[PDB]
Symmetry: D2
Subunit: 480 residues, 4 copies
Amino acid sequence: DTMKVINDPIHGHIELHPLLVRIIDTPQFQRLRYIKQLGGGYYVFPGASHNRFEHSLGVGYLAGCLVHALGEKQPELQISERDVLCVQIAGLCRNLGHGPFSHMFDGRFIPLARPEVKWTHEQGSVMMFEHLINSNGIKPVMEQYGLIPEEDICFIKEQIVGPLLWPYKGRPENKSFLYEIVSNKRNGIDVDKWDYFARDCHHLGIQNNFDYKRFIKFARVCEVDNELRICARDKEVGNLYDMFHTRNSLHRRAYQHKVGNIIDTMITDAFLKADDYIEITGAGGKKYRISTAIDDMEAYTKLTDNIFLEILYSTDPKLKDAREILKQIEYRNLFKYVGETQPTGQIKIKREDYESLPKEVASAKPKVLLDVKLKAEDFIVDVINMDYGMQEKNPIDHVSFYCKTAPNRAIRITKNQVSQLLPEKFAEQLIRVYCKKVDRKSLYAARQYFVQWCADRNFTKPQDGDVIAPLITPQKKEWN
Amino acid sequence: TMKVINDPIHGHIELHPLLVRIIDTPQFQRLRYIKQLGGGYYVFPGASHNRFEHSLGVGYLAGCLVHALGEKQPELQISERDVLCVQIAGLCRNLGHGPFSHMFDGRFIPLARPEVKWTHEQGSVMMFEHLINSNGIKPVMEQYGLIPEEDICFIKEQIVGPLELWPYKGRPENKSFLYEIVSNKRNGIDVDKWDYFARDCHHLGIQNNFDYKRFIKFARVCEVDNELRICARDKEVGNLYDMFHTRNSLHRRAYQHKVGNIIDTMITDAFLKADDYIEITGAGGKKYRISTAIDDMEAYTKLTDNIFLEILYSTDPKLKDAREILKQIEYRNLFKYVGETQPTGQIKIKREDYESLPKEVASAKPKVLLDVKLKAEDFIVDVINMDYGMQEKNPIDHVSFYCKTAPNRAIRITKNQVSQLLPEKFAEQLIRVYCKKVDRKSLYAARQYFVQWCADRNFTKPQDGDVIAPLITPQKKEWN
Amino acid sequence: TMKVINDPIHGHIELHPLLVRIIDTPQFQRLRYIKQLGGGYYVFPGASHNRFEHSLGVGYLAGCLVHALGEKQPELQISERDVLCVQIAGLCRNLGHGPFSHMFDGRFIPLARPEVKWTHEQGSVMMFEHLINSNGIKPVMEQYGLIPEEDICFIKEQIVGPLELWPYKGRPENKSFLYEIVSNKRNGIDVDKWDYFARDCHHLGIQNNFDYKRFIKFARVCEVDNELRICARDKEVGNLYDMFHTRNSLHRRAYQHKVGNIIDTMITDAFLKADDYIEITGAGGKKYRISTAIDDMEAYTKLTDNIFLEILYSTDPKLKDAREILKQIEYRNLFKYVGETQPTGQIKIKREDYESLPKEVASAKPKVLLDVKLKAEDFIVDVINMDYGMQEKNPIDHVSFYCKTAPNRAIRITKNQVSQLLPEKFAEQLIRVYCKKVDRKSLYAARQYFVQWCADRNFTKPQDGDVIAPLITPQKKEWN
Amino acid sequence: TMKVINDPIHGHIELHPLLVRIIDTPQFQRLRYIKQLGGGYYVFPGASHNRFEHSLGVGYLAGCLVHALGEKQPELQISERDVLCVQIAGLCRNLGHGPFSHMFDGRFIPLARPEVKWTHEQGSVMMFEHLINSNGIKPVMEQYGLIPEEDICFIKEQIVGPLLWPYKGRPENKSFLYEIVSNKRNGIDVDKWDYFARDCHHLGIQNNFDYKRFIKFARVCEVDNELRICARDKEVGNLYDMFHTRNSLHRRAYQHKVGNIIDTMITDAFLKADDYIEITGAGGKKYRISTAIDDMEAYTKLTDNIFLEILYSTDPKLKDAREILKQIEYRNLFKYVGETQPTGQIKIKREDYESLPKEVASAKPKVLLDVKLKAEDFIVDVINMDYGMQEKNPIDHVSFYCKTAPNRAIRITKNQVSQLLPEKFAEQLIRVYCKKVDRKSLYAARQYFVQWCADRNFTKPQDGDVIAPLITPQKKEWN
Ligand SMILES: Nc1ncnc2c1ncn2[C@H]1C[C@H](O)[C@@H](COP(=O)(O)OP(=O)(O)OP(=O)(O)O)O1
Ligand SMILES: Nc1ncnc2c1ncn2[C@H]1C[C@H](O)[C@@H](COP(=O)(O)OP(=O)(O)OP(=O)(O)O)O1
Ligand SMILES: Nc1ncnc2c1ncn2[C@H]1C[C@H](O)[C@@H](COP(=O)(O)OP(=O)(O)OP(=O)(O)O)O1
Ligand SMILES: Nc1ncnc2c1ncn2[C@H]1C[C@H](O)[C@@H](COP(=O)(O)OP(=O)(O)OP(=O)(O)O)O1
Ligand SMILES: [Mg+2]
Ligand SMILES: [Mg+2]
Ligand SMILES: [Mg+2]
Ligand SMILES: [Mg+2]
Ligand SMILES: [Mg+2]
Ligand SMILES: [Mg+2]
Ligand SMILES: [Mg+2]
Ligand SMILES: [Mg+2]
């Protein structure tokens, strides 16, 4: 019981308080070693071997950096050792709830497998955190270091999932600023983003444009509407627009890579086919399924990327169909990308419409001679919502700033006070279409249906529309 | 045969012996004493880099791209001759730069020689001709299979464009693509940008988002309007918008830094006050001034950053006024920043309005108690044009693309086929105002004149407007 | 045809379609599930990288070196065929690694199957043959002008050396230089090292000063003894001694980290306790154990790090003992490090005496009051051989060099032609001792036994000797 | 209060307003015009960096180390006052460097003013006193709680050493503070750490040494009744590695054969100019390049600018100096012949340097020579390579602690670490150059040189057998 040191390639030598080490050295936390950060992105970017474990250490470290820096600069905030430790634990623990292949699991699998339940990694982290604390005798160790478990566990959980009028019980409103560090529900400017920017870039072979250390140096707490909040320096506003630009760039190049996504979808399909057969032991020896392991934390503890290899290496003929899809991934016999488009005008596609979309593509009537005829089931249509983290809103409208001539006066800055070269909108949708039949003739046909469907619905012209469907794109005067 | 040089940006670069002969002349070696970023070194202490090393990198990258095109498409008939002419142009396109780079071609020469129409481009061509004739390079070109008459023309055209329908004499339309490498007048996507992105970032301590090696891998030559041009791969379009975003971002953080610009302005003032008295010896022992050194290339060869120190260290009382300004830079008693604004609507401020602007700030009538009155000589107004390299135009409208299914077929891609989160405009103006009088009470007045002038002219609200002038900002209804 | 891959170490790497076909097989894709550094990930959290991405890098760098030699020396007659077989050997020399890489050939197989001698080199050859036969690669080789019979032999010889005076049948002596690229049996200077230096360091958070791109630039083929060999430039000799210094440094800081090794040892113990019960299905349905999967390549294909989690997640009481050891790794209840020593003088410690060493440490008779007496099986004693890759020999004595005045003339350089600051010896042994009993009193005893044992055997004084055993170290005159 | 500066090596550094006042002076700003690596820029084009930014980094890292020690061990009672004095020493210990850094006090001043002993450290002290007196810094020091009598003394002692317990600035219970900026006990200081990282960044060679790890592990313990900085025991390998890397950087970059010859050519030009250039000092007096060190107002104006004052001049009195500088621009350099070392314990002394070109021209190689060379055509450069403490092992002068008892200092010896370490910590390199550059002269030069190595029992040059096949068979060891 003194400070352990860990060497991390992103942050250097990180110091961990022994309470943190006790939390880290549990089956619940160490599980994160076996969950890839970027899921199926490893199958496109071979550097992306990193797991949630190391990401969590970095978020914990950075949470500590920010809280320590605010305390040194402004002792009048009364930040205690207790606060520091509570913010670091929340930083460490806000990835506990991720499942096999990270966003594959909460984004694709659980929505199809358990459409009735409303599941997020955030709730999962909270439940997994409760399990971690109770199973490993952490409450007495918290007490030992001057934490008060009733108040402080509440504080930690609220930092992860939000409130369970001043809505929080873990801290009063004079400590309001502390809720902005780990998971910032006001504007999304938090230390979780900063670690993944730096870490994902290191591994992906794409370079990070955002300087989080500069941001920490310029950060200050100021009063805004009778709450103490974190404020940025006025002239740093362009770097914040840039922060969100970079997040969107990373989603475009890497996290929504067309093949990475289809790999995630194939794994999802294999897990759906395996769900009847794979049994995971939870508490009291109760058996759970890949889809039901989220209902018992002892079972969820054992639910990791290992599932993929259990399926791949099985010999049970009940798992043949799941196994074959995973085998298609090994041979690179993947579902084929047909193309990408977007909606035009006001037109937004609704979450209830998603399931009907493969039918709409197979129903198009392209005027081209076709060998094969494809049906609904041969098409995947993937609808991706790209934004600045606040649906249609500009997150910088929800940031408070200060000027050097009056460092304790909060101000607001509007988009027109910064630049005319910024985005005029902050959300859009991407529609990717894939074909499950992979031969040259199926692929040719799939492209004709696709381009015709874009034309019927007045979506944007695919970039290669004139090459893949030269017979189709001249019908459309809106495209020349 | 080949020399090897170690560059921290590019690694071990190979140089042909003809390039070595060009490099080892006084005309090229001059570039060692010209800082890339001028007054930026006085704000970013890592920015010690000079034009010399940037030039080596531009030459190297020019060679990389031309070699890559030839290896992949032998049918283009790219010869060793072509390769060497492209590298020579890349090496020598910075020969024309003057003391503190953009300070000289951007502030000093406009103010000292408004009647001449001078660019660093024209200077590079003149300095290249002088380099060749002064050092016996034509026989060395012949040695390695160049034809000086054709090839010198080709090199100059790559630097400055046509010297005068196919407008170029150095190479025919079937080598059109060679003119897009070093200095791309079609859309500004060239190897010169790529080197300064990477090099400036290494030195500034800001990180580069753009990957030029990826670009080179995906580049191809295709037919467009009876010309063989360089085409990018369709789905690389996003990286191209990102390239220009990064150029703009670097101008905002570093190259147009408010203090870096004012330091450039103070140095320009000192150079104007010294221009009568400093002598630079050129051809046949005739003497030139800082402002006339551009008329003789032997004199220009000796016109470097050293001028700054020749003035600072002088004891001549005729240079007292010039020397005092440089002394104020060393003590950091600089002209003081008042604020930044932008125009609204269709209003674009022209080059011939610039002189009248300090006049208009002085003539504002702010209704407050002012303990002083300042006049127009006390104000600097700096007008900065920020764009994507093509005035109001979208340079990606001037890029040709190819699709994977037909790599020989060129296509175009529109802004709406890419994303709705892109800029709606591609040009804007920033206005910065500084005060030459620095005392407590002058600055308070200066702020009031400024904010009132912004309100008078319907310019945007300064970001700190409400703090620097609490009494001036309610009188303007267009600000809420 | 040409596929592009983005690797954080090398950038954008181009793969020929034959290489893609080899890569897209279960035998190659298996390498995604084998950590490069094994248990080093449990100490250095950035070391999540797997053998797969290392393999791509070795293949890429093999191509770099063979291409650079062809461009510079056309007279060598290096064919497209040769380039491909060198790249293939580079890609496939990691196929034979097993779970946790060096844990498996270095600790597990020796203890489980002591009679047979197995290496990852032999494994790669066997797994490569299996890859080719299982996936129809011989016809695809013919398609791109390889001659399967000759070229498969060439590839295998590059990986394991001669198969059975010029000993190679895959290529004649006029192409001997091709055997020094992937796996250099003469001196160990090869591209495999170059990739792992750069890659391991990226992930570990330790920086390496070896420049392989410089080495490749200076490399030439010359005649030595009726054989064409690769020669280095004379003045690059210092960088080669530095290369081996860096390898030794990496073994000291990371690859032989005292805790990383003990975690490797605990995993080995868990695998031995599980070996009777875990079953892997091989050819025609025959069943193998972890220890015997090396006898059938269909079984070996499915032998990866996943074995760790099958054991950890099991509920069978037959696996209780194996599972409990892995559980102790999760809770960080590791066998505890006691200290490090080395032999004095001539004293080598033999392959046979390893088993006796735990017995010896429990036999020492420290004159100290001890609350407990430890037995032999409570001690682990680890002997590490640290060298420059050729046991007692100086590998630079086996490097050929060339000089600037006569680039065709190979020469030798001796240690005294370089520096007096170099190592006088090139091999040494480290001895680490660990205690399986971890409470305060057993540990305190373990330190007395160990320090007394070091004194007994005239080994070096542990660095902490005077602190951990103050009553013991005055009995030895030589320690002062 | 605090200014922020962005440095590509250390990131965003915070500077106290007293440090800003010291920085914003002609004496400090002068460092912008002095290249860190002098003539190394003429070989490594990324090495454009100046002494200015290095100084900022040293000041920053001095602050890092002193702060880390204060946080971890409050009982040491390190004050805001101490921190500020350590940072000032760090910022100011490069003030005394002259044009082209080590060219000036390593080659020019020894040849131009052999009668005197001048070091960069002495210059730093003098330039610091000048900076303080000329810019009203004493009242500003007092404003921030410093006491100039003690504190100016403390700062100077940190830079040059002391001017029984030999220091007046601070007592023995703050002994450890003298180990931060310029460590005279073993050379493990923050000045090294900044130049490792910064030089590597610019040179395009990668840094092997982790200073942040060292700082996290460092502790203050009692050693012989002083409180000293101690390293953690098992990090001793990283310390041997630190000095190995310093040696590596000297071999690849700082003693590069062409960089040194360019330094030597610039020195020759500065000698040929020394009678004719005026530098105006205090009172109006005129000083020379060689005498500017005697007046700090004059030295303030002595920078790399001198190189271009010479190159651009038209005075016929500067013709000889100017022509040498011109030959550097055209790359018509003195040419490298070869490298050798002494043997046994031949140790070549500074008193014998002048004799060496004469010895090479006197060698009588048994070979037919179309041309003959004499002393004036040869340059002989002798480089002392060591671990910073001539013959000694600096790690024998480092104190360590163990994890089991962190307050207990101990010693560690070379055999407690590794058998693979250097078994000698100093050596000499001898490089020979020829001033005449045509094909026949170079052929001659190589015969003289190889014969000279043979005559003196120096090591066989690496290329000996190619450049001189007729000379190497005579010698008995070399075959
Ligand atoms: N020489 C080194 N350079 C860089 N990182 C290192 C080095 N040695 C170890 N590390 C890494 C591995 C870990 O992530 C981290 C801490 O390791 P280390 O100090 O070896 O701790 P430890 O817990 O094994 O030792 P102890 O408990 O004896 O202090 O630093
Ligand atoms: N060991 C090294 N590692 C990295 N860079 C180096 C090293 N040695 C020198 N350099 C740099 C300095 C130059 O930019 C470039 C060429 O240096 P070098 O190869 O020493 O050429 P040189 O011209 O002095 O030798 P020569 O003419 O004998 O071939 O590499
Ligand atoms: N914008 C980008 N910047 C950097 N790396 C990228 C980017 N996009 C993709 N990558 C990486 C992922 C892969 O490892 C490699 C090749 O990806 P990419 O060009 O997307 O191939 P792809 O196979 O999906 O396209 P296609 O088959 O359509 O040519 O580059
Ligand atoms: N956006 C940025 N990213 C990285 N570095 C920056 C950026 N902007 C400025 N820098 C550099 C330049 C300087 O080294 C340092 C401080 O610059 P900056 O904060 O602009 O200071 P300033 O002194 O001009 O502002 P002020 O006095 O208004 O606080 O950071
Ligand atoms: Mg430990
Ligand atoms: Mg978030
Ligand atoms: Mg050379
Ligand atoms: Mg341009
Ligand atoms: Mg593809
Ligand atoms: Mg090997
Ligand atoms: Mg400022
Ligand atoms: Mg020193």
